[PDB]
Each structure stands twice: as structure tokens, then as C-alpha cells.
Amino acid sequence: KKLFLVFWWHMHQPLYREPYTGEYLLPWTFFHAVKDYYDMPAYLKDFEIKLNFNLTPVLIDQIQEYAQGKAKDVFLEAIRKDPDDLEKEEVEKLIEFTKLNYEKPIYRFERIRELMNKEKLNREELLDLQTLNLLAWCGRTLRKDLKDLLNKGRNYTQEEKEYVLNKYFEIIKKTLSIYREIKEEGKGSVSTSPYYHPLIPILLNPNCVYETTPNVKIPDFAVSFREDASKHVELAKEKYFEIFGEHPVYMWPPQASVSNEALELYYEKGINMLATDEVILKNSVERASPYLRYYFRELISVFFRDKTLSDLIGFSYHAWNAEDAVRDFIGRLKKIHESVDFQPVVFVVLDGENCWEYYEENGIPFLEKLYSTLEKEEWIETLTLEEAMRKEDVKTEVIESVKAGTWFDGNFLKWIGNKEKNEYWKILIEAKKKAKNDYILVAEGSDWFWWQGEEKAPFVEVFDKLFRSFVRRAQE
Ligand SMILES: OC[C@H]1O[C@H](O[C@H]2[C@H](O)[C@@H](O)[C@@H](O[C@H]3[C@H](O)[C@@H](O)[C@@H](O[C@H]4[C@H](O)[C@@H](O)[C@@H](O[C@H]5[C@H](O)[C@@H](O)[C@@H](O[C@H]6[C@H](O)[C@@H](O)[C@@H](O)O[C@@H]6CO)O[C@@H]5CO)O[C@@H]4CO)O[C@@H]3CO)O[C@@H]2CO)[C@H](O)[C@@H](O)[C@@H]1O
Numbered sequence: 377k378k379l380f381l382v383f384w385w386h387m388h389q390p391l392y393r394e395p396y397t398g399e400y401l402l403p404w405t406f407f408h409a410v411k412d413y414y415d416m417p418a419y420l421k422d423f424e425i426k427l428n429f430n431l432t433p434v435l436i437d438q439i440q441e442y443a444q445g446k447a448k449d450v451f452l453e454a455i456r457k458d459p460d461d462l463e464k465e466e467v468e469k470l471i472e473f474t475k476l477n478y479e480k481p482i483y484r485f486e487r488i489r490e491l492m493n494k495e496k497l498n499r500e501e502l503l504d505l506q507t508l509n510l511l512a513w514c515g516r517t518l519r520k521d522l523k524d525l526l527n528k529g530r531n532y533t534q535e536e537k538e539y540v541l542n543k544y545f546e547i548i549k550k551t552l553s554i555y556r557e558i559k560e561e562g563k564g565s566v567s568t569s570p571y572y573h574p575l576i577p578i579l580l581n582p583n584c585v586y587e588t589t590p591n592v593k594i595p596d597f598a599v600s601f602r603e604d605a606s607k608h609v610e611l612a613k614e615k616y617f618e619i620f621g622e623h624p625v626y627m628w629p630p631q632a633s634v635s636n637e638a639l640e641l642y643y644e645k646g647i648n649m650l651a652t653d654e655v656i657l658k659n660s661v662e663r664a665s666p667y668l669r670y671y672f673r674e675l676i677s678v679f680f681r682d683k684t685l686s687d688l689i690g691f692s693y694h695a696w697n698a699e700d701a702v703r704d705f706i707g708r709l710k711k712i713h714e715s716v717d718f719q720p721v722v723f724v725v726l727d728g729e730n731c732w733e734y735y736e737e738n739g740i741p742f743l744e745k746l747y748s749t750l751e752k753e754e755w756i757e758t759l760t761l762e763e764a765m766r767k768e769d770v771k772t773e774v775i776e777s778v779k780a781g782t783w784f785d786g787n788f789l790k791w792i793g794n795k796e797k798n799e800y801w802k803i804l805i806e807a808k809k810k811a812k813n814d815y816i817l818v819a820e821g822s823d824w825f826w827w828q829g830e831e832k833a834p835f836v837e838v839f840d841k842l843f844r845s846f847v848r849r850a851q852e
């Protein structure tokens with residue numbers, strides 16, 4: 377009697393490339409590529425487990441541009457420059473970026489504390505500021521290789537900074553290939569999402585938000601987004617085919633977001649399985665175990681993730697010692713194993729790149745110990761998405777209707793419903809009536825709405841500039 381454990385690590389970045397200047401206005405794709413996007417599937421070279429990955433097509437597009445050397449990244453240009461050539465604005469952005477990340481354990485360099493307590497920075501201090509920002513984002517693979525430079529902690533030279541930069545781009549150049557390799561070798565399945573990570577249920581039917589928040593105000597959706605929702609899925613299939621050589625049969629719905637109409641669209645586009653959140657299961661069916669494979673109207677398979685286990689990794693274990701955390705996780709899995717007489721399927725699904733920066737040493741002690749311990753428990757079998765879809769010795773159930781929602785409180789309020797987020801939908805609705813190209817699809821990404829209408833925070837004005845630029849470019 378095994379416990380079937382399925383990790384599904386979701387990787388995504390919205391499009392940071394401004395269409396009039398061609399510049400990447402934030403560096404987050406670069407930094408998560410060098411820190412997480414190669415390294416997370418690279419664990420499979422050292423550990424004999426299965427791990428699965430979602431790659432959004434807009435993320436793939438950007439990884440390709442960085443690998444090809446065509447991304448003009450304005451933040452990275454300020455890192456690369458000799459400090460004598462830095463503009464004041466570039467120094468301010470570098471300071472602000474450091475202050476944003478200052479308390480994360482991956483920024484735990486004593487020299488960073490020294491630099492942020494200086495009234496004025498000279499050339500050698502700016503070089504350290506540049507290089508330590510780079511090295512803070514070092515991934516597991518190069519943390520071994522650059523150990524000498526990482527332990528120095530200070531007094532970096534321009535030659536050393538450039539050496540780090542070169543190694544980082546080598547990692548990026550190898551990134552799509554490792555996903556293809558682990559897929560071909562049967563070490564994991566790779567899924568994708570509708571192209572720019574939109575909220576498919578709202579595009580199909582904005583009235584679905586009322587199934588969970590009846591009091592919400594939404595704008596007048598005077599134009600149909602139903603064909604765009606189809607296009608997000610179809611273009612994603614095409615990009616996935618280019619990279620991996622088949623049409624994707626698994627997709628991760630952005631924000632775990634589903635609805636009856638969205639599940640029908642996924643089915644019509646040939647998707648055979650997806651996962652969503654336990655809250656939607658609880659919202660939709662009174663008696664429902666999350667350890668079964670569900671069939672929605674016998675059209676498409678659905679798994680509901682184990683929210684507790686996913687949130688332990690996403691929110692709890694960064695504050696723990698690595699062995700405390702792994703013992704706790706294994707203990708919980710054992711309690712599941714002993715709590716039922718069938719073989720449960722346990723889906724652990726969360727973002728694959730956003731939690732590690734809060735862990736000691738980028739979560740490498742935690743993941744190395746977790747994966748080492750998992751692979752040695754005879755009662756746990758980690759599965760690919762393909763194996764979880766096809767496994768016969770699993771329990772199964774039919775469901776006929778779900779209540780539309782997301783993994784954020786089961787509802788859509790993080791993307792719609794207040795004055796500021798509604799104004800973005802209004803801009804998009806008016807833009808859609810006049811849209812001439814696929815930049816309207818870029819503007820439909822969920823990320824723009826997530827950041828809008830929150831309390832002010834550094835750099836979020838850039839998301840607004842991007843969104844509004846895509847909206848304008850869509851009409852030309
Ligand atoms: O603000 C202070 C904050 O600091 C830390 O949080 C940071 C976190 O450690 C880091 O991983 C990242 O979080 C990312 C995350 O990695 C992504 O996967 C993504 O999270 C989504 C998540 O996977 C989904 O399950 C869903 O999360 C829901 C939960 O299911 C709800 O239970 C609720 O979670 C709260 C949880 O119950 C509490 O124990 C507490 O830890 O706080 C949790 C969040 O408030 O709400 C969330 C939805 O917010 O949806 C997620 C969003 O798509 O995205 C995350 C970032 O949004 O960044 C965190 C900094 O924001 C520390 O862990 C926290 O305890 C602390 O409160």
C-alpha cells in the first residue's frame with residue numbers, strides 16, 4: 377500500500393518587455409531563471425524521484441530571449457556597468473532593489489548591511505552592491521561552482537562580476553533543454569497554461585464571479601472575451617508543441633481557476649487532466665476526499681491539491697530548520713498513509729520559484745533533505761502527471777459541477793471588484809473593442825490585475841506602465 381505523491385511546481389513571469397522600447401523593465405525573469413528555473417528541474421539529476429513542472433508560454437518566450445542574448449534588461453545593464461558609468465537613477469534603483477530584498481535570507485551578507493548603512497557609496501562599494509545583488513540570486517548548481525566567490529562576501533572586482541554574469545547566462549542557455557531532458561527521461565511531466573496566464577473563467581463568463589461573491593461590483597463587459605480565452609489555450613498548445621513535440625495533455629489553470637465553462641473549454645481543446653484547489657472541491661461537493669482522481673462530467677480528469685501540504689512549503693517551512701521541516705512533512709505524509717486503506721493521490725501544487733528566497737540558503741538544505749528522505753521511504757511513490765493520470769490502482773469519482781473560483785480565498789477578489797482593479801478591466805474592455813493584434817492577449821494576463829489597486833509598493837508602477845503599454849500597442 378503506497379502513498380502516491382505528486383509535486384507540480386508552477387513557473388511563470390508576465391511579459392516584462394515593453395513593446396515600444398523593447399526593454400525588459402524588471403529583471404525578475406532573469407533572476408528567477410538563474411536562481412530557480414534551471415535548478416528546480418536539475419534536482420532530478422541527483423535524486424531518484426519524480427517532479428512535475430508547469431511552464432507558462434510567456435515565461436518560455438522570455439527565457440528564449442535571454443538565452444539568445446536579445447533581452448535588453450535595464451536593471452541588468454546597471455549591474456554590468458563599471459560603477460564609474462552608473463547614472464544616479466541606476467544607483468537609486470539598485471539601492472531600492474537591495475532594500476526590497478534586504479531581509480530575505482538569500483541577501484544575508486554582512487557586506488550588504490554595511491552598504492545600506494552608508495551615506496555615500498564609492499566605486500568599490502558600488503561594485504560590491506552590484507555583485508552581491510547578482511550572487512544573492514545564485515542557484516544551487518553554481519552555488520557549488522562559485523563557492524570561492526560567494527564566501528568572499530565583499531571586495532568584488534569587475535572581472536569577478538563579469539565571470540558570474542557569464543556563468544549565469546550559461547545556466548539560462550541550458551534551461552529549456554533540462555525540462556525537455558527530464559520529460560524525455562520519464563523523470564517528470566511538463567504542463568503549460570493558457571498563454572499569458574489569464575483568468576479563463578472571467579474571460580468566458582464574467583458573471584461567474586457571483587457564484588462566490590454575490591455583492592461584488594464589476595464593470596460593464598460590453599465585449600466578448602470568449603474567443604480570446606480559446607486563443608490563450610490554442611496558442612499555448614502551439615508553443616508547447618514547439619518546445620516539447622506534442623500537444624499538452626496536462627494544463628495548470630492560472631491561480632487554480634476553474635468554472636464549469638472553463639473545464640468545458642479545456643476539454644474541447646484536448647486537455648485530459650488539470651489540477652485545482654481543495655477549496656473548490658469543498659465549495660462544490662459536501663463529501664469529497666482530495667485523494668481521488670475526479671472526472672468532471674466524464675470529459676476531463678481533475679485532481680484537487682492538498683492545500684495544507686502545499687502551504688507548508690509555500691508559507692511555513694522557510695522559518696524552520698531544514699530537518700525540523702522535512703521530519704514534519706514526512707510525518708504528515710505518514711499520517712495520510714495510515715489514515716486510509718486505499719492508495720491516496722496527494723497533489724502538492726504551488727509556485728515553483730517564489731518561496732525559496734525566504735529559506736536559508738535558497739531552500740537548498742530543505743529540498744536536498746526533503747528529496748533525499750522522500751526517495752528512501754518505501755511506502756511513498758512519487759509520480760509524474762502521466763502516471764497520476766493513468767494509474768489504475770487509484771480511487772475515482774465523478775463530479776458534475778464546480779463553483780467557480782481560485783486558490784485565493786476561493787474567489788476572484790484579488791483580480792476584480794474594487795475601484796482600481798475594475799478600472800483595469802474597463803480599460804481592457806474599451807481597448808478590446810478596437811484591438812488589432814495579440815497584444816490584447818498580453819494585457820489579459822492575471823498579473824496586471826493582481827498588482828493594481830493595492831497599497832503602494834516599490835516597482836509596482838512598472839507593472840502599470842507595462843499593462844498600459846500593451847493596451848496601447850494592442851490598438852495600433
Ligand atoms: O507577508 C508576510 C508573509 O511572509 C511570508 O510569505 C511569503 C512566502 O513565504 C513566499 O513563499 C511567497 O509566497 C508566494 C508563494 O510561494 C506562491 O506559491 C504563491 O502562493 C499561492 C499559494 O501557493 C496558494 O496556496 C494560495 O495561498 C493562499 C493560502 O492557501 C491561504 O491559506 C492563505 O495563506 C496564508 C496562510 O494561511 C497563513 O498561514 C500565512 O502563511 O499566510 C498565507 C498567505 O497570507 O492565503 C494564500 C493567498 O495569499 O494562493 C497563493 C497566491 O497565489 O504566491 C505567494 C505570494 O503571494 O511570498 C510571501 C510574501 O508575500 C511568510 O510565509 C508568511 O507567513 C507571511 O505572512
Ligand SMILES: OC[C@H]1O[C@H](O[C@H]2[C@H](O)[C@@H](O)[C@@H](O[C@H]3[C@H](O)[C@@H](O)[C@@H](O[C@H]4[C@H](O)[C@@H](O)[C@@H](O[C@H]5[C@H](O)[C@@H](O)[C@@H](O)O[C@@H]5CO)O[C@@H]4CO)O[C@@H]3CO)O[C@@H]2CO)[C@H](O)[C@@H](O)[C@@H]1O
Pocket residue numbers: 386387388389390404408476631727729730822823826831832833834835836
Ligand atoms: O504590499 C507589499 C507586498 O510586499 C511583499 O511583496 C514584495 C516581494 O517580497 C518582493 O520580492 C517583490 O515581489 C516581486 C517578486 O519577487 C518577483 O519575482 C515578481 O513576482 C512574479 C513572480 O515571481 C511570478 O512567479 C509570478 O507570480 C505569480 C504566480 O505565477 C501565480 O501562481 C500567483 O502566485 O500569482 C503571482 C502574481 O501574479 O508573477 C509575479 C509578477 O506578477 O514581481 C514581484 C513584484 O515586483 O515585490 C513585492 C511587492 O512589493 C509581500 O509579499 C506582499 O504580501 C505584500 O503585499
